[model samples]
Target: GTDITNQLTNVTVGIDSGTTVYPHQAGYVKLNYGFSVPNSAVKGDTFKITVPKELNLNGVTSTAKVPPIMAGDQVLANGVIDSDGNVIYTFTDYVNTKDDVKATLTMPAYIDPENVKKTGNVTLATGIGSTTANKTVLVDYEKYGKFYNLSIKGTIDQIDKTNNTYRQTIYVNPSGDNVIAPVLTGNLKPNTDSNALIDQQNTSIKVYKVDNAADLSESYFVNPENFEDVTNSVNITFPNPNQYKVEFNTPDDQITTPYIVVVNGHIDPNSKGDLALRSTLYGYNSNIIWRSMSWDNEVAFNNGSGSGDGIDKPVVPEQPDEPGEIEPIPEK
Candidate 1:
């Protein structure tokens, strides 16, 4: 019953996730190791090895029994969970029956993707033989692998003297990887108007087919009688019945495939300035981290007709900087 905890050797450590690791991910550690005790370590002597808080017991119950390990099959030691949750190994009467009492070790331990704070060279020191495992943790996906990249584009037209209104069109590209987002939100308002916000009641949204973002030319169209139809699988809502901001909710489907959103909006005349629009996509719940609002399309408008002067009409920007911030809806 002496302090035989320090008597150990032949320890190894490594990562099993290989090249990449992701959120909500799970993988084992490559730890081919062993340990032994001294002669003073009599039967009933106990020691333990911790699995570390940064890691879960591979998502198992903390008090779960340690399986029969390959310790010469004599059960020289029985492993149990300490109140502190570490695996405490208690030597049995069989330990005295064998010489140079030693055996290999086996255990399941992995990073808790949900709570794992940072990445790169994550270490888990169990304090046994002063050894720890190192892993090049990567809890993020590269650009092409992202599943929630929503794009926005638009064009502003001249004032229609006949209708006594000005017109502009916004094209949304709700594109993605394996699983696209189900909810999308954005805010849009003309910097200068007759104080007239976007005509939500008169604004129209239609489906078109634009395979890629490059050149954004409409080669075909997805003619749905209306995006508001319950069966259309698409619904658009505004903020508190406000006119400037819009939310496009396209549940499970319609996000992928060749579908596009062409929003045609009309505004009252005499006001003119910048009409910039920014959008962000969302998943079903908090499990998702949204990409930034760098997808801003700016448009300019004049007093009554012709192209806007201050900013004119520019197209979608280049590959947006992931560092962009989400803008707030500040309509007065």
Candidate 2:
């Protein structure tokens, strides 16, 4: 009795798919089969194997490109998947006296499961007619997305060395759980030289909150005594008498949402020329990432006729003569 099992021997199935995959990446799977034929007296000679669609063993999906199985640049068998989703490979010619026959099958798979650590397997028919190929695969993740934006502004003005006083106001207003701290610094420039003056101790820097804005506008220069010295609500640090570091605080309520930072200080007469005042605010977002917002401007000291010093001096025009006729005064 002629038997199919006696003709075919040592049939095996194995996977050669690569080891790694990303969020939405494609992977490959290769299959190799081995067998031998010792019968030439038998008339029926053919080789066949079916790969199942349900054998997505490696957390991947589908398959593709089932090219011909070659012995050495010579096509021995062609591959095709029927309408029933069964991958079938047929030998080009009858297998009569062939030995140690080898065939190769390649497939593609896809994966996308968000953020995860998972393991899966793919199964294929191991023998000439049996399910026996199981290849394991591994996957991993990267990061997520959740972030916001930040900005800055800077300015300076000459606190007239004549009066030796300067007042600067820094403002802050951010949206949705954002924070800003007002910090001020100075750089004095000489009229004739490119180098800046460095007698920092010759000046005194004080931080205060806006208590009476009306009085500050009307009596800040002339009266100069209405508003009392107030301490800052947020933490502050001064390396010296004139250097200031304003610490920012998180929001408590919308009432104090935007902080009005008022800086007051004095400049020595001998150390006055060109004063550059720069204001910076440290901002924080919901993610706790901190950024800097800065504003800077420069003013020429002792060069303007205005009453106040720095950029705080108010402008005033000369009053015109009264509308009544002036001739009547001369006739009298």
Candidate 3:
């Protein structure tokens, strides 16, 4: 067999099919591109592969690690950007009929709701002025986007007086381009009274529809009955994104016992838009990440004392012995 010094053939390029990319998530596109060399090729024959640059259409960056590239169980060299912003890879070592010479490229891809479909081209060139075209790469967002990270923050008074008021804040960040309302769910503990401590008609929780953290007006009231029911959990739906607060009031002198409560929820896609759109989105759990939180209160009595159960009697001081008169006895 004679070595072919000037020609290269049978080049192809493609992407990993049926792959999903998520919004504002640490994601990448896998490139499956390669070429074949003839048995007559020389050991020093060279070829080049170039991939056009892609944009961050989703308008986000990943703090997560960018994955490394692979080639048929073997890792390939890292991609380098040329002066024209195209990623270039060079291969010089050659073997006869190395048909499985594939390369996988991992690109920095951030998912966003506003991000549209992205496309690019890949080119394979040889020293003999031979080239191939129409090799394309396509990246799209997931069919249903994901929710932002949900968080809950606040505190429960460890030592509180009767009728002590506590507040909890729930916050959500919409990482995607669209806006989403949140569904908040929580549970109240069984009791706030201890054997040594006594609380009368003191366990109560109230939720309000407010604007934001800055202004917390009682826009509307949710049923306390709904919250106190053991069979049902407290659920609240917001019309928009905001830092909503939940206030829990404990009974006066509710002491010596710990009261427990938990709050958790996620962004609900079903609550977005109007009644019409929301109706269509029913049965779809926002699939936003579900978050959970727990807190407790240990109340202590400020003033507690023990007393004998009896009527009080006045004490009369004894008279001086020398001047004291004889006491008269009562007759029937």
lDDT of each: 0.44, 0.38, 0.26
Q: Which residue runs does candidate 2 get wrong by more than 4 Å?
A: 1-158, 174-177, 180-232, 240-242, 250-256, 305-332
In candidate 1, stretches whose alpha carbon ends up further than 4 angstroms from where it belongs are: 9-17, 22-26, 58-65, 83-85, 118-121, 129-136, 140-332
Candidate 1: global Cα-lDDT?
0.44
Clashing pairs in 3: 23-111, 24-111, 162-251, 162-252, 162-253, 163-251, 163-252, 202-251
Which candidate tops lDDT? 1
In candidate 3, what are the lDDT values of residues 107-204, reduced to their tens digit? Answer: 33222222233222222121212443332333322222122222222222111123232222222111212222323222221232221111122223
Model 1 C-alpha lDDT per residue in residues 1-332, reported as the tens digit of each score: 64466665454434344454332111334333466666566788876666565555533223434755445657767776667656677887766766676676656554443345444445555545466655554433112112235444333322333354433434455232322444434445324333234445756655443344432223112233322223244556665322433333455443443244445555445545345444343333234444432233344433232221223222232322332222344232
* Per-model TM values vs. the true structure: 0.38, 0.32, 0.27
Q: Considering TM-score, which of the candidate structures 2 and 3 is the better prediction for this target?
A: 2
The predicted structure with the larger lDDT, 1 or 2, is 1
Instruction: After the best TM-score superposition of candidate 3, give how far the Cα of residue 18 lies from its true spot, in angstroms.
Output: 2.6
Error at 170, model 1, angstroms: 34
User: Could you tell which candidate, 1 or 3, scores higher by lDDT?
Assistant: 1
